[PDB]
Amino acid sequence: TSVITQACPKVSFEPIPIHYCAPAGFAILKCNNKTFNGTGPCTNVSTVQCTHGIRPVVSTQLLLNGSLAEEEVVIRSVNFTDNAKTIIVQLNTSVEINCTGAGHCNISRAKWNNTLKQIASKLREQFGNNKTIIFKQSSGGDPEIVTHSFNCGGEFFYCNSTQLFNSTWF
Amino acid sequence: TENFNMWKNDMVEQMHEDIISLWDQSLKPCVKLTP
Amino acid sequence: GSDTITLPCRIKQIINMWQKVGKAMYAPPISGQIRCSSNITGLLLTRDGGNSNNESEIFRPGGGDMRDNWRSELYKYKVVKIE
Numbered sequence: 362t363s364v365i366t367q368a369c370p371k372v373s374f375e376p377i378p379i380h381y382c383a384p385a386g387f388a389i390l391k392c393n394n395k396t397f398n399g400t401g402p403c404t405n406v407s408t409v410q411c412t413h414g415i416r417p418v419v420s421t422q423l424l425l426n427g428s429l430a431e432e433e434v435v436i437r438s439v440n441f442t443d444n445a446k447t448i449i450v451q452l453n454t455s456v457e458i459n460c461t462g463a464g465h466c467n468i469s470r471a472k473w474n475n476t477l478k479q480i481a482s483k484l485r486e487q488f489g490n491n492k493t494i495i496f497k498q499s500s501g502g503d504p505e506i507v508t509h510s511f512n513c514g515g516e517f518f519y520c521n522s523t524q525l526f527n528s529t530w531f
Numbered sequence: 532t533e534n535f536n537m538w539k540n541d542m543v544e545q546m547h548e549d550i551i552s553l554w555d556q557s558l559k560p561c562v563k564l565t566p
Numbered sequence: 567g568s569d570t571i572t573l574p575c576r577i578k579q580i581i582n583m584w585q586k587v588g589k590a591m592y593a594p595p596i597s598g599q600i601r602c603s604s605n606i607t608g609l610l611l612t613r614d615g616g617n618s619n620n621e622s623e624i625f626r627p628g629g630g631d632m633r634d635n636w637r638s639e640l641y642k643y644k645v646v647k648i649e
Contacts, residue, residue: 365562369593374558379549381542381640388648392536397642400537407532412542415639417550419584421629424608424638437641439538444615447628449638455605462577462600470569473606485613485623493622497614503582506630509573510581513602515558516595520575526627534644541643546636551585564588 373515376418376426382411396430399437420511422522429455434479441485450480460513466520473525481530491531498526584632610634 383389389412392403416426430451438448456473460466481494499507509520577600580591614624629635 362565363563367559367561369561369591370559371593371596372557372559374554379546381546381643383648384545384645386648387645389541390534390536390644390646392534392642392644394642397536399641401535403534403536403642404532406534412640412643415546415636417546417553417636418604419550419554419632419635422610422627423606423629424610424635425604425606427607428639429607437538437638442618444613446612447631447634448611448613448625449634450609450611451638452606452608455607458604458606460575460602460604462595462597464575464577466573466575467570468573468606470571473571480609484625486619492620495622495624497624497626499626503630504578505582505584506628509627511604512558514597514600516577516600517579517581517592518575519578520573522573522627524571524573526625534646536642536644538637541640541645543633543636543640546640547633550632550636554585558592560590560592562583562588562590564583564586 371515374512376416378414378416380411380414396432396435398435400439418511420509421505422509423458423511424449425458425511429453434476434483436480436483441487448485452476453479460518460520462514462516466509466518468525474528477528478530494530496526496528496530498523584630608638610638 389409391409393405418426434453435451439446458468484494509522610629611625612628
């Protein structure tokens with residue numbers, strides 16, 4: 362049970378947009394379908410030397426500082442049927458979450474309630490014609506899983522999000 | 532054209548290992564892992 | 567008027583690692599003005615079960631597999647062998 366005592370240092374972690382180009386005798390094929398949805402035969406596609414400016418942000422339940430959908434909210438999952446599988450959601454418009462070491466994160470109430478009904482306009486049923494969509498919060502598990510954990514200014518934040526995922530829609 | 536893509540990779544496994552190896556060189560702690 | 571969703575937050579020093587199954591401890595803060603401004607660009611959810619195809623569907627926040635974080639950016643890409 363390996364323990365390692367390194368000179369634990371107070372550094373500042375900053376994200377450098379990472380570009381991933383073609384690896385050796387291989388070629389990167391970007392699908393240009395504005396609304397490509399996961400698995401499937403991409404129609405419009407083209408070879409590229411490198412992907413794009415990818416910002417490697419480590420965090421939970423909320424993907425941040427990344428790529429948005431240019432058309433509508435697009436969701437993706439390996440199997441929308443198996444409840445055990447993660448469902449990723451690509452948003453239409455960015456939302457802001459301002460945080461400080463003082464223990465809080467505030468995000469606009471209106472901006473976020475709107476994205477919720479948008480995401481609600483297509484959940485599991487599969488853009489289902491209609492049914493009741495409910496947003497509750499984590500059942501349990503690790504702190505990093507149960508809360509929006511992320512690395513802010515070098516420090517590790519564990520933001521309680523019950524208020525973001527506790528509502529009902531149709 | 533007319534190609535296939537999916538919930539597999541490109542750089543998912545690659546990137547993951549780059550980022551894991553990036554964090555290590557940057558945010559150094561006082562680790563404890565179980566073998 | 568200017569109703570903002572205030573979320574209680576906490577800075578922990580002992581954390582469960584995301585890299586591999588481990589635990590780590592970092593030094594406490596030194597700055598008195600840790601300030602971040604991020605743009606939520608997405609969401610990673612999960613759905614309650616045992617109610618397949620019925621009237622309601624519960625969705626809770628998720629995450630954990632950082633791969634699912636790279637997947638959101640790399641979805642539209644693929645590596646093909648070239649001669």
